[PDB]
Amino acid sequence: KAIKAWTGYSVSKWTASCAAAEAKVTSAITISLPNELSSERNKQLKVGRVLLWLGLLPSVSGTVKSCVTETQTTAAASFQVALAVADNSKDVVAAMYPEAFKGITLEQLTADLTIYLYSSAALTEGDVIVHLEVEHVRPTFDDSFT
Amino acid sequence: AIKAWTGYSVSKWTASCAAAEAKVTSAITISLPNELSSERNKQLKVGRVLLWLGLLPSVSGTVKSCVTETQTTAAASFQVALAVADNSKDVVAAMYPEAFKGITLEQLTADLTIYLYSSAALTEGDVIVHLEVEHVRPTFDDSFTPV
Amino acid sequence: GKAIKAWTGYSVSKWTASCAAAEAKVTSAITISLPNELSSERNKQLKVGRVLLWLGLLPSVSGTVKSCVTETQTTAAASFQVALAVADNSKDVVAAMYPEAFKGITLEQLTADLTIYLYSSAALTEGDVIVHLEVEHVRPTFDDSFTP
Amino acid sequence: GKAIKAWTGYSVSKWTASCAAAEAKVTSAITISLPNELSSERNKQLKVGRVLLWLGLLPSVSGTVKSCVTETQTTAAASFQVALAVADNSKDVVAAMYPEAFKGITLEQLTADLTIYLYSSAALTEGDVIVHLEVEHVRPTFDDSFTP
Amino acid sequence: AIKAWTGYSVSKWTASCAAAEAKVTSAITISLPNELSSERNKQLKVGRVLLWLGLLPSVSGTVKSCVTETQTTAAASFQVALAVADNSKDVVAAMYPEAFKGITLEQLTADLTIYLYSSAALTEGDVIVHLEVEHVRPTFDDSFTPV
Amino acid sequence: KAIKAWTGYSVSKWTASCAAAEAKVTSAITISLPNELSSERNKQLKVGRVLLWLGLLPSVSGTVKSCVTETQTTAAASFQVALAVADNSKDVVAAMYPEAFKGITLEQLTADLTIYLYSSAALTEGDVIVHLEVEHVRPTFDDSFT
């Protein structure tokens, strides 16, 4: 299905391939705004709902977990505070934060939040593809002259 | 058992699975059935797509398959698919009600690809990948020419 | 000059068959093969309606050229002696309409029993005659629903 | 004997094309060129309707002469094998009406795609055949107002 | 912006200006546009005539032009013209609403002439003499012949 | 004043400083889409009205003219076909093409149109600043997942 954005809101996405990691190692994955949103005016737009989900190779065995939280000094801790976790054990490998981050600016979103990934077994580059939604108000612009 | 839309009809065809080694993903090409291979018909628009497997009773281990836009690496196809057809589930099938709406049979045959994964080795015919496609009810010429 | 509307519930399928090389006055038999799109067994049991044959000739095709569709005859020449209508080059319209002679048979029967017979007074080189064939028949119906 | 009224909103444009010299049984291709008066780009996008071709022969033109308008074929002779109507000298009326085969294309498409094919059993000298062509098409419209 | 009469249509075409020396008048011939060059069309009757120039941004000095009955001396044409198209005015144009009513395109092409004057020298293309003509809406054959 | 865009339309701008030019020389000025519009989807948006106007140094003497037209093999010719010209002699040094380019895509706009500038006196870099508006439909985007 599709979950339509709120009136006056838009959606953005950007993904990041997982880095190599050993057994049960939790790794941190960075968040960077896309070039469309890196503009000054767009940076100030307020965020709405959010959604996180993973793309796993068909051979990905063991348990794999990921979530988005305010950056924790230790990577593993984030799960212990995340309001939801994307876990491969579930039928749908996703996790929605419908209101956790409502009200922050895209700048804040990219500044303090981060993606955390955990795998019981060892990982290799490209093993896990991290997908992310960011609902926010529509960027807007209009002008004239003389 | 699922009914088709008004103005649409379902075409069904099968493809065998090539021999492959353990844990290695393979690709299976989509070739249109004869009654759709005519130039008039392949221009038709697609609706919903249904994929469901048939396994030999001896099939063991894990087997997964999905149809997606052709990807450079076969394994990666499982990372953009809406629904996967997996043997560990009750019904070994998947549905793509929204993914491929609007595509043409030309594009369906040329762009998509059936990707199949097995934890263990496979031998030819070990899996029968059945594919079912909704599309506009094909139309036929209904008059003779003068002379 | 006219467009023979097909009967309600019927459609028209059209395909060609290039003539094989032949010598003067030699009658040749051309086999009728169903098009791929109809070749499915599901469709093979459909009931034929009106049948129409008409030729296309190279402008340099001299002499007399005749063709008709009949149940396969032991001798090729004999076919014309029973055909109710023959398409000829010399006539105004090079065609032959069989509104009733074959109604009721199955497309499988059409492929198995009937044959296209072609005769040229002068020698024919391949492609000199393009035997067009237009078969009206019940509209084939595709599967209505998925498989659970 | 008859005057085919053009459709409402359509007009008829008529022009000729003298035949080039040719040898016996040689099929020749004659290029279709729009008349100057229609040649404007503004008009080139007009949609064609019915098309009519008919020949004029010197009274001494013996043998058989055939001509038809078809999408350009790789081999000139083949054109007749697909033309739905052919103008022949031997028939009562040396003409060929295409009421539908070309409806919908643009005059630019008409100039680019179709070709006039001509065949004579005997040798032709220049001007022996005057291929008249009459193309019905939407009425061109001129500018309604000045430029300030 | 000016509307044409009922039963009339406007044909517009342009003519470039030939190189000429200072203060010397030149003549420019009127040639019918292709869509009017057919024998049927050139018999048509004319209505109002509009002349207006386009100057290169570098054009300096005085430039004048008018269309009149062909005169033996080019300069003299400015002495019988109703309105002149001059560059010193706001709009570099002229109008001949009554002068040429009733003339035929044959006569318009054969009798009139576009005369152009410049205080300074001109180089080819330095002026684009646009001409706009009202005339009876040309009519087309609307039926095929028997055979 | 300000001339509001049409319902569902937006506005964009981008300027270009004049190059050096000698007396009465007409120069050509290129048009390049901004990075916001260089994206594939935005490129297809249809244009509406347009406006051109200049910024002159206070010392700019003589006559200066500019206009936007389909590229002409010779630079000077463009004026002879422009539906309006921005000329310093007027009170407001501007020229509006309210409908000349309506219906083309931003790609077409950047491909075939070009800016032409003419100065009776010699010019130097920065002497003339060419300002341009491009009204067009709003770029739009919206998405979802699983």
Residue numbers in the entry:
A (entry chain I), F (entry chain I): 42 to 187
B (entry chain C), E (entry chain C): 43 to 189
C (entry chain D), D (entry chain D): 41 to 188
What text comes from the article?
Cowpea chlorotic mottle virus is an icosahedrally symmetric plant virus in the Bromoviridae family that infects cowpea plants (Vigna unguiculata). The 180 identical capsid proteins are arranged in 12 pentamers and 20 hexamers. The asymmetric unit (highlighted) contains three subunits A, B, and C (magenta, green, and blue, respectively). CCMV is thought to achieve this by detecting a change in its chemical environment upon entering the host cell, which causes its capsid to swell, increasing in diameter by about 10%2.
Cryo samples of extended CCMV at pH 7.6 (containing no divalent ions) are prepared in the presence of a photoacid (NPE-caged-proton). The sample was plunge-frozen at pH 7.6, after which the pH was lowered to 4.5 by releasing the photoacid. The capsid has a diameter of 32 nm, with the disordered RNA in its interior not resolved. The reconstruction is indistinguishable from one obtained without first lowering the pH. This confirms that the vitreous ice matrix has prevented the particles from contracting, even though the negatively charged residues whose repulsion keeps the capsid inflated are likely protonated due to the high proton conductivity of vitreous ice. Once the calcium ions are no longer present to compensate these negative charges, electrostatic repulsion causes the capsid to expand. We then dock atomic models of the extended configuration into slices 1–12 (extended and partially contracted particles) and of the contracted configuration into slices 25–30 (fully contracted particles), from which we determine the motions of the capsid proteins. However, when we rapidly melt the sample with a laser beam (532 nm), the particles begin to contract as soon as the sample is liquid. When we prepare CCMV in its extended state and lower the pH to 4.5, melting and revitrification of the sample allows the particles to partially contract.
